[PDB]
Chains A and B, each alone.
Chain A
Amino acid sequence: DTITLPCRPAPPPHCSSNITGLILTRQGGYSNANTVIFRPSGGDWRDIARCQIAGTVVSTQLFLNGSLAEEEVVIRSEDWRDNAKSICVQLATSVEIACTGAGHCAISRAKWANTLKQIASKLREQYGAKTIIFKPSSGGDPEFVNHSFNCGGEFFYCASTQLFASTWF
Chain B
Amino acid sequence: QVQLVQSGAEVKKPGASVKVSCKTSGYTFTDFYMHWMRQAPGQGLEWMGWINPTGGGVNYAHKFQGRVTMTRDTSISTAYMELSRLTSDDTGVYYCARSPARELLPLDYWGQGTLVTVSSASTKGPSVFPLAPSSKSTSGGTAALGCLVKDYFPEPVTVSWNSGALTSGVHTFPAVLQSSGLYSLSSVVTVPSSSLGTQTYICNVNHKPSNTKVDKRVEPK
Contacts and interface: CB of A to CB of B under 8 A. Distances in A.
A28 B59 contact: yes
Given A37-B62, A82-B104, A143 B55 contact: yes
A137 B103 CA distance: 19
Interface string A28-55: 1111000001000111111100000000
In the A-B complex, the 7 residue pairs with the smallest Cβ-Cβ separation, listed nearest first, are A29-B61, A42-B57, A44-B55, A140-B57, A44-B54, A140-B56, A30-B62
Contacts of A43: 52, 55, 57, 102
Contact of A84 (B63, B70, B71, B102): B102
A5 to B, nearest CB: 19
Given A82-B104, A83-B104, A144 B55 contact: yes
Interface residues of B, number: 24
A138 interface: yes
A47 B104 CA distance: 15
B138 to A, nearest CB: 55
B16 interface: no
A108 to B, nearest CB: 28
A28 B57 contact: no
A84 B57 contact: no
B79 to A, nearest CB: 13
Contacts of B62: 27-31, 37
Contacts of B50: 28, 42, 84
8 contacts: A25-B59, A28-B49, A29-B63, A85-B102, A86-B102, A138-B59, A139-B69, A139-B70
Contacts of A70: none
B101 interface: yes
A29 B70 CA distance: 16
Contacts of A83: 59, 104
A141 interface: yes
Interface in A116-142: 137-141
A44 B59 contact: no
Given A29-B61, A29-B63, A84 B104 contact: yes
Interface in A81-137: 82-86, 137
A139 B104 contact: no
A28 B49 CA distance: 7
Nearest to A50: B102
